[PDB]
Design a protein around this ligand. Sequence first.
Ligand code: HEM
Ligand code: HEM
Ligand code: HNI
Ligand code: HNI
Lengths: 146, 146, 141, 141
Amino acid sequence: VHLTPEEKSAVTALWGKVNVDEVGGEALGRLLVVYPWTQRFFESFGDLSTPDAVMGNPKVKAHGKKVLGAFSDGLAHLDNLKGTFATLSELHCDKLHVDPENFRLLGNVLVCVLAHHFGKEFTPPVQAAYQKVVAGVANALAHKYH
Amino acid sequence: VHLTPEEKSAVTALWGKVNVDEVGGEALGRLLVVYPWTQRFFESFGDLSTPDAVMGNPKVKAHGKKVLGAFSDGLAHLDNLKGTFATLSELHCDKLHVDPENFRLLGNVLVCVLAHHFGKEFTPPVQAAYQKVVAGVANALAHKYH
Amino acid sequence: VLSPADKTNVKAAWGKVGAHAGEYGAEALERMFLSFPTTKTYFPHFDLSHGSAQVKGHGKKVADALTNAVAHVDDMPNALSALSDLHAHKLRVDPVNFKLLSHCLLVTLAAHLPAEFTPAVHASLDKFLASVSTVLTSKYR
Amino acid sequence: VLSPADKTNVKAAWGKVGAHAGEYGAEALERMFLSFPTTKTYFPHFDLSHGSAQVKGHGKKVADALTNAVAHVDDMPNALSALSDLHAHKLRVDPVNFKLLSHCLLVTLAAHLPAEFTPAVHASLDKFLASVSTVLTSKYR
Ligand code: HEM
Ligand code: HEM
Ligand code: HNI
Ligand code: HNI
């Protein structure tokens, strides 16, 4: 919650330059490399035995697309993230049994990926705006757990 | 956080049996004993050199009572904790410079103190309701930070 | 680091618990599932119905591991080596949940040990449970 | 624990940072203050806005401490002993803030080291910063 109009424009401007499919695969991959206990949810994805095995894993990449696709759609609804992600929250709780702490981990890995891709363009104020976003999305995905 | 009508009743009923002087002194005291780095905020309170010194400190006891009074006022505002603690939030941020993580620690300790006093009466469902409350109060006190 | 005074407090407190350890472990789990529902995401394969025998059985396992850790408080990394292996390679519970269970164990102890749960013992028990948690997550990556 | 590959990765990445260590330390701090305003509660005596002489000076201190940790990567509890004393007895920063600064250091490194900040190196740096953080909070109680 509580992005400024200048921050909303900054978020939107940067995201227009984002290849969502590519960044999604990269973010999910890095999540599984940097925090390898998160691999617990993806046993069916096959080989996750090395950083390269994870990052280049086609099922990881594919999944990253749909994950960041949903993230991308949520950027159009920054004033109602809880509503936006309510059904995905319920699904991740009731069907997938995913600890919402994982959403926080993914959020910060995503921020690292954005910094890596954009370099100096990912300025401290732009980061700050995106930290508000990933916190809001994680909080929204956590909101319907019970 | 959203308490159920059944939990609101449980919270209010237990609180009606709470000795604020004892529980307040015990909660603030144990914060300073169990997480002694939090003493950084209370050097003006004088002797905090031993557990007995902390628990018996007149200023610790007086302040604990005052803190619990604010907590009590929040319990009469459960549907709008952010509103009722908005003023205290700004104060702790701008005037007191207190890291809001400490609010969670105090909530932890308060729940332990309630359990210590009430014993088996502090049932798991009663605890669950009070965890919603202390999370709600901590979040509300953190909300106006900037 | 657990001070010698910490170890004295932990041994004395857990000694008082005694044969109630299994019961208190189950109670702590129940308190955790109710207070912190996200922790249930690690038990979808469990029967979580009220009074669940499966939860009580798990409470016993958790308590027994803690009893062993108290008995080997000077060398917990070695004592809990196999358990730490299991947590890192199989269970893979996010580290944040260990603080939630630890808090619920403290609450359970507080509710059952009115005389023993002094501020100093409270502090020692918290350090102890944090130390056990550190060992159990020590091989995660 | 840091693996042989972790230490190779950390030494290579921080070595590449090179003379920029101080600059990057200051940038990481600024990123932290802007992204996580609660961290500002530890610096009420500081100008925290961009171009702060105090933040630049403090960034150099933080960076130099990390450089020393890298040089003594197999003995960080002792190499950082004086600093961990200061954190435990004076600074008394809540442990969560170390994760916030560590994240901002990773972001800073990612923004400056396109070729070097691979997934494996990212993983190693995160472990390293977590290990430094653990040392600096090890004497709190
Ligand atoms: C920005 C955060 C996230 C978003 C927006 C998101 C979104 C989605 C979507 C749209 C699906 C497909 C839903 C369906 O199958 O009906 C999904 C599935 C799934 N998600 Fe998430 N997700 C997020 C984070 C995570 C994280 C961090 C994890 C675990 C580390 C996770 C675990 C899973 C799993 C296991 C599935 C099912 C995969 C399968 O089909 O085998 N998600 N997610
Ligand atoms: C979590 C619930 C808390 C509540 C409801 C609360 C409430 C209050 C209230 C009512 C005051 C007095 C305000 C005034 O003088 O006008 C106060 C002061 C203060 N609070 Fe809190 N507080 C909480 C937590 C904390 C924590 C966890 C810390 C530090 C670890 C803290 C640090 C302080 C300090 C340093 C003061 C000023 C003490 C003095 O006068 O020297 N508070 N608080
Ligand atoms: C919130 C999740 C969670 C936490 C915080 C946690 C924290 C702890 C702590 C901390 C003090 C201890 C001592 C402990 C001990 C144990 N756990 Ni935990 N465990 C947790 C979720 C599990 C799960 C899940 C299993 C597997 C249970 C099963 O039977 O499938 C488990 C299994 C065990 C076992 C059984 C091992 C075996 O089968 O050989 C022991 C013993 N543990 N767990
Ligand atoms: C959010 C708060 C915070 C964090 C996360 C943090 C994390 C870290 C980390 C983590 C990797 C390192 C290596 C580090 C190193 C240092 N800090 Ni930190 N410090 C923090 C708040 C401080 C403060 C406050 C000071 C005192 C600054 C001053 O000038 O008063 C400080 C001072 C220092 C000094 C100077 C010591 C001296 O004067 O002798 C060093 C070195 N540090 N700090």
